[model samples]
Target: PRLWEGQDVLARWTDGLLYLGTIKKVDSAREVCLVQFEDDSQFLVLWKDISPAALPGEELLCCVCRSETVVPGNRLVSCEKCRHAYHQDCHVPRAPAPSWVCRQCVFAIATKRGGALKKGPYARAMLGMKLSLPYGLKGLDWDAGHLSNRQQSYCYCGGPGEWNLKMLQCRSCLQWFHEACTQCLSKPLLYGDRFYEFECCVCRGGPEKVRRLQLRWVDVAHLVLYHLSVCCKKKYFDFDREILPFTSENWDSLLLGELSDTPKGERSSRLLSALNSHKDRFISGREIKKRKCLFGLHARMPPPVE
Candidate 1:
C-alpha cells in the first residue's frame, strides 16, 4: 500500500482519460475513492487501474463554455454521478441541481423525458433556455426529447395544431399556428430562433386562451343539471318549479346543440377545470342575481296561441 499512497494516477475508461487520487474505500477490498479532474468531476477509480507507474495527463479544458477559469469554484458546479464539473452557465440549458448529473450519465438514459428522439442536432438544447432540467439530459441527441412531459406545440393563433409551411411552430410550447392568428405578422413582436426558447403570444395566457378555446357543451350541461338538483334539494329558489320543467322538457332537443371538438374522456377534466375557474372568478354572492337575469329570462318566451 506504500507505493499507492499519496500518488496521482491516470485512467482510461472510454475514449478519454480521467485523473484519480489515492483515496481508499471501505465498501470492499478495492482501493478506490471518488476522484476528480480539472473539471471537478468525481468518480470511484481503482488503484490497479492507474498505478504509480503512470500519472494522469494534464486536465482537459471545460467540456462546456470551453473556458478553464483561473478560479473554478466561482462558476463551476460538480456532478455527483460522473464527477464532471460544468460551468453554471455552460450547461446545455442552465446548470446542475444540488445533486447533479453530467450529460454523460444522462445520455445513458436512452428513454428520456419526452421518451423519444427529435429532429434537431442538439434538438432543443441549442435553445437558450431560461429554465434548467432537473436531470442532466442535455448535450446528447435523441435524448433531450424526454427532458420534460410538456413538449408543447404552438401556433401563431396561440393554439395546438399541425405544423405546415403555412404555420410557424414555437420551440418551447411546440404549438403551431397561422400568421393570421398572430399579431406579429404585421411586424415581429419578438425575434429569435432554434438557438433559444422563444416565448409565444400564447404562453402569456390572455387573449390566446379565448382565441384557441375548445368548448365543452357536455360539461356545461352537467353543471346546469347539478345546480338544478341542488336547487330542488334546498329550495334555493323557485328554480326547481320554474326552470326544471323547461330544462327537462327540452333536454333531449337541447343536447343537439352540445358540440365539443375534444374527445369525451378529456371533457371530464377540462370541464372540472372550467368549473373551478368559474367558481373562483364569479363567486361573490352576486352571481345568483346575474344568474337570475340570465336564467330567469329563458322562460319569458311567448307561448304559442291556444
Candidate 2:
C-alpha cells in the first residue's frame, strides 16, 4: 500500500537511528517519500527506509507532535467528540476542559448546523491575533505567552505576522507588511501575484533621506508562491479573480507567464515544478460559476486541499 501524504512515519537516518517525521509527498512511481522530520529537515528517501510511526490500537499519540509519552508539564487530553488525543500544550487554546472538543469537531458541527462559528478570544488567538483580554479573565497570561511564542514578527496593524495572510516583505530592512496596510501611489495590476521592489515606510524615507532597494525575482518568488498557495486554499476565488483568474486549465500557463521573465536557475526551476505538481487541484472558473448558479452565491464548497 502507498504511504499517504502527511502521514506520521519514522525514517532511518544515516546515523542508523530512526527519527520521527511526516510524509510530505509519496512518489509511488519513484519508490520514494519526501519526509520532513521533527527538526524541519526534509529529504526524499526510499520507501523501505520509512515505516508507519503509529499503528492501529497500539497507543494514543498526540496528533500535533505524534508522541504518546507524557512529559513533565504536558498532559494528554482527548477530544470528547472525535476521541483524538493531544498533549495539553500541543493543542491550540491550551488547558482544554473535560468537555472540550477539537477544532475539527467544532468546524464540522458548525458546518452541519449552518451558522457562523463564534470567534471568541481563543479562536482569534488561534488565528494568530494578539488579544487584549480583560484583566480578571483566566488564561490571560497563557494567551500572552502563546502569542509571544508563536509570533515571530508583527505587522503595522499590530497584528502578528501570519504566513496565511496576504503580506509583503520590504527588501531594504526585511520588514513585513500586509497588502491592505501598505498602499502604493498607484494600484498595481496584480496584487500579491506581481513581483516588485518594495521598501517599507520606515525603510524608504521619512523627510529628507531616501533609500532605494531592488528586489530580485528569486527573493520574492517563494513569498509569491506561498501567497498563491494561501489563495488556492479558498473554496473559490472571489475578488482575487479580477487580478488573476486562476483556472485549472490555465494553471501552468498562468504561473509560467508570471514567472517566465525571471532568470531561470536551480531554485526557480524547483519552485515552478513544485507548484506545477498540484495544478489539477485548482478549482476552475467555470466550476465556481456553476456552483454559484446551483447553490446561490454562498455555497460552501470544500477546499481543494487542506
Candidate 3:
C-alpha cells in the first residue's frame, strides 16, 4: 500500500542517520516521497528507505518555554505548518482558528511574498551615530567601550574605510560621508583656504526665516583636539594648554557672544562643565606635530564669518 501524505515515519538519510519526519508529497511513478523533519529540513526518500516510527513519538514541548507542562490558564497549541508546539499565551495574536503557523513559518511566507529588502548607507550611518554618541559627538568615548568592533568598522557608505580628511561629516545630522560618494566638495574646496559649512542633501531644505549657523573656531578646535588626541594614542591631555590663547576668558566670550539667546548666567558655566569633563581626551599642539607626518596634518582655526 502507498504511504499517505502527513504520515509520520523514520527516514534513513545518506549520512546513515534515521530522522523522524512526516510525508509531505508522494510520487508513485518515481517511488519517492518528500519527507520533512521537525527541524524544517526536507528531503526526497525512496519507499524502501522509509519505515514507520516504532513508538508514538516524544512528548511535544512549547517552542517558547521549551516545556511540555501547561500553565494554570494556558493551553498547548501546535503550529499547523511546522508542527511546533507553543502555549496559548506564548504565541502572538491569539487566533480562534485551530490551524495556526509559528512566527518563523509566517516570516518565511511573508518574506517570500515581499521579495528582498536591503539597508542603505543612510540607515546604517544613523544607527551607528545613535549608538556611539555620548554628548552630541560620535566616537568620543570610543576607548571607554562606547563603540563595538562591528560599529567601528562601519563607515559612510556602509563599507569600511580609515578616518581621514577626505571623510566629511555633516554639521546638521552628524553623519559621515565620503568625498567621492557625495561629491559635496571638490579637491580644491576640500583642501581649500575657506572653512565652509556643510549640510547634507537631506537637511538642506528648511524654513527661509531661520538663519543657517556656522560652527565657531572654539567648537572646531574642540573637535580637532579630540581627533589629535585619539590619533596620537594619548589617554589624557590638558585641554586649556593644547588649544592655547583661547583661555577661559576667550571660551566664555565665544559662547556668550554666539549663544546670546540663552539666559546669560548659567549657560556658559554649563558649557564649560561639559567641555571640562572631556579635558583628558584633548591633545596639545606638540602632540599633533609629533604625528603630523602620519596624518598629513593641517591645523585650520578660522573664525566663522557671515
Candidate 4:
C-alpha cells in the first residue's frame, strides 16, 4: 500500500488491490512466475489473479513482436479501449498466421469469455481522459538526461546548456545519449515504443564504452532540471518486511520508512550517510550493491499526511 504512494499519481488503487504482469508459465505448489514494470518494479503473483494496469501513458497492450497478450491471470492487459485483456497467446498468437483480436469476431462469432463484459457508453466516454500520452519526451529538445539524474527538480539534463545533444536516457545505467547518438532514433521511445536496447553513440565504442555524458547526481546541488509498475500478489504491493532508515539489510523497505516512530537524530544521521555515500546513484528503486557507500533518496511524506 505504501509503495503505491510513490507510483504513478494518475493510477488508481483500491485498497489491497495489486496489479501484476502476466507470465506464460503455470503456478504450482512450488513454482511461480513474475512480470516486470517500466519503473523497474516487479510482482510475483501466480496462483491468484493480480493483473497490473498498464503504465498510464503506455500504448495499448501489445508486445514488441506485435503479438497480443496471451497469458492468463495477468491483469495488466485490460485495454484502455475495452478493459478487455486476452491471454498473451490468445492475443499475440506467436505461432499464428495472423494475430488474434482482443474481442471475438462477430462475423466470426465474437463472444465475451471471462464474464467480465466491457463497460457502458458512459464509462467508454471516460476513455477520452485516459487517452492522453505521457508528454515529457517533448518540450526539451531530444537531449541527454542521465538515467539516475535526481540532480534537481528544474535542472533536467541541464537543458539548453549542458549535454552535447538532446536524447533518451537508459533506465538501466541512468545514462543519456542523443536520439541520433545511439541507434534509438531507429527505434521507439518509451511508452508504445519503449526502449529495449541502444548503442551509446557518444560513448567510446570499443575500449571503455561508457560515455557518462553527465554525472547529474554529483552536480544535483548545482540547480537542476530533471525528469523522470508492478506485479502483484493478492496485495497491491509486496514490500520487504523491514522498516526504513534501514542500516542492517539489503536496500529495500516497507513503503515510506516510518519516520514518525524513528529517532530524529538516527533518521537524519543515517540518511545523511546514505546521501554522502552514493550521491551519484541516488534515484528511485535503484539497487545499491557497494556496502554502505554515500547515497541519498529524495524524501516524501506519507500519503495520509500529504
Candidate 5:
C-alpha cells in the first residue's frame, strides 16, 4: 500500500518479535513506524505486538493539544519535527514544509533564550519612569526636568523661577502651572494615587470634562500594555511602535485613508471605550497603584514575528 506523508495509524507489538509505535511517516513499501524492541534491542520491527524505542523521524501519537490520537485528514495536520500530529485548525499552524516544527519545541526555544529577563530593558524604563502629574495641587521642589527646560520664554505666574515651583501640566496646551496659580492647587486632592485621573483647571469645562492625558495612538498603546501585563505577566512595557501601527484593520492602524473615515476627537473616545471592554482581563488593583500614564508604556513588549 502506498503511504501518504501525514497519514496516522496505530501499531502495537507486545510480543518479543514485534515493536510498537504511532506512525509518523511512511515508506509504506519499506520502513514504517519502526521501533527497537526493549527486550532484544537488536532488531527493529514495524509489525508484531511489542512497543519499543521510537526512531529519529517518527512522531508520537500526541494530538495538537498534546492529547494522543490517530490523525484524520480533514481534521488533522502534522508537525515536521517530532512528527506530532495536530488538529487542522488548532493553535499550532499546519506544517508548511517538510521541516516544519511543533509549538512545544518553539516554546522550549523561547524559554531558553533568556526568558526570565525577557522584559529587562522595558521594566527598567518603567521603574525609573517619571511623569508630570498635569494637575497642580501641592508643593514639592519637583524639578520640572524636561518640561521646565522646554520653555524659558515665559512663566504663567510671571515671577522669577516661580513657574519652577511644584506644578501640574495642562492636558490641552501642554502647559505647566503651579497650584497657587490655578484652582487645581486651590483645593487638595489625592495626586499621588494611580486611579486618580486628573484634568488641569485650564482644560476643565466640558460636560465630559477634561480630555484624558493622551492621544489616540497613546490610548491604543495603553490598551496593549494592559493586555500584555495580564497576558504576559509583564510589569513595565510600552507598545512596540511598529507593531501597534499595523495591529488590526480598525481606527488604530495607520492607513492614511482611514484618517478621513472618522473625526479625531470621536475616534479616540470610541477606541478608548473599545479598549476598556478588554481591560478587565489585564487590569488589576495592584497594577493600578503603579503608574498613571500609559501614554508611553514605560515597559513595552515586542510584537510577535510573522
Candidate 6:
C-alpha cells in the first residue's frame, strides 16, 4: 500500500485498467463485488454505479436546434422522427426556449411535433402493434376490446379464440386477428402514485392530466402504445403516405368531440415542444395554448343522443 500511494503509483498499478469490487460476509476474505483489470486481473469494488454528477448546472446541446448551453434532466426528450432524445435546456436555446430545431433532418421535413419524441431511423417502417390483456392476463377475452390487452389481430373479438396465432378474417366484424389479439377485459387504473402503469391515454386523467404530468412528448409513446394496441394485430394495417393513418385524420383527432377538457384543439403535449426538426414544425410554449384551442384540446361537443 505504501508503494502505491498517489496518482503516478496508482496509474502504474492500474496501467491496464481497474474494475471496482466490494467485500461480502462481514470482512470475509472473498469479495461480494467482483472486478476486472486491463491486465486481466480482477478485484472487488464496494462503490456504487456512477450516476449523473451534480454540478451547479448541467448543460447539454439540444439535438433539435444544435445550440450550445442547455440543461439536461427533463427525463430524455428525444426527437419523434429520429428517436434523438436530449436535454430540455440544451435545445434551440434562446431561439426556441423549452424546445429546439432538429439537426439530423435538415432539408427533409418540417419541425413538426406530433408522433414519438424518440423515433427510430426507419420512421416509415411498419411495425406490428396490438392490444393485449390487462394485468398481464395471457389468454382471457373481451367484448368491447376496450381493455388494455392487445389482440393478435386488429379484430380482437369477444372470446379467447384458438391460439393458432394466425391472421384471420373476422366473422362478425369482418376484420383480422391473431392469437395475441385475444385478451381478457380490463379497465385502466389511474389517479395516484401507481398511475405510471398506464397502458392507455385515459389512465392519467386523459389528455389534460397527460399535459399536467409533463408528458407532452412523453405521451406520444402512450399514443403509440394505444395505436399499437389498436392496429398491431392484423396482418397489415391501413397506411397512407408514410405515417400510419389514424382515426379519420391524425393522432391529434380527439374523441372528445369539441368538449375537450384542455385548451381546445390540441390537448397533446407536442404543442409545447421546442425541437428543430424538418419532419415537422416544432411549436413552442407560446403557441401551445392557441394551438390547443386550434386542435380543440378543450373543444365542446354536441349533446349525446337520448
In Å, residue 194's CA in model 5 sits off its true spot by 34
Evaluated with TM-score, which candidate comes out highest?
2
Candidate number with greatest lDDT: 3
Candidate 4: TM-score? 0.17
Give lDDT tens digits, candidate 2, residues 75-138: 8877676567778887644645347665534433332111122345433322221121111222
Candidate 1, 278: how far from true, in Å? 38
| Window of ten residues with lowest summed lDDT in model 2 | 128-137
lDDT of 4 by residue, 224-267 (tens): 11111111111111111221223223222111233335565555
What C-alpha lDDT does candidate 3 achieve relative to the native structure? 0.45
Q: What is the lDDT of residue 122 in candidate 2?
A: 38
- In order, what lDDT does every prediction score? 0.36, 0.44, 0.45, 0.28, 0.34, 0.27
Global lDDT of model 4: 0.28
Q: Flag clash pairs in model 3.
A: none
Which ranges in model 6 have alpha carbons more than 4 Å from their true place?
A: 1-217, 225-259, 263-306
TM-score of each: 0.23, 0.27, 0.23, 0.17, 0.18, 0.16
TM-score, candidate 2, is 0.27
Candidate 3 per-residue C-alpha lDDT over 1-306 given as tens digits, one digit per residue, 9 for 90 to 100: 448899998675532234689999999998789999989988788765666532225346665566788766787777676676777766553423346665434422322111111134432323222222112234423433222232332222232223334344456654543333332232221211123455554445321111224444344445444444444555333443443333344444232335545464654454445444433433333455653212112333222234
User: Which residues of candidate 2, in runs, are more than 4 Å off?
Assistant: 5-59, 71-73, 80-83, 101-165, 168-190, 193-306
Model 6, 1-306: lDDT tens digits are: 111111111110111111222222121243123333346554433222101112234334444344554343443354444345455543322123343333322202311222221234422211111222112233534447322223322321222222212223223223333312222112211111111211222122221112112233323323332333333432122122112234224434322233234553443333223121211322222354432211111111111111
What value of lDDT does candidate 6 attain over all alpha carbons? 0.27
Q: Write the per-residue lDDT of candidate 1 for residues 273-300, one digit (tens) a residue.
A: 4433544222312346534312221221
Better of 1 and 4 by TM-score: 1
C-alpha root-mean-square deviation, each candidate: 21.0, 18.5, 20.8, 20.5, 27.8, 24.8
User: Could you tell which candidate, 3 or 5, scores higher by lDDT?
Assistant: 3
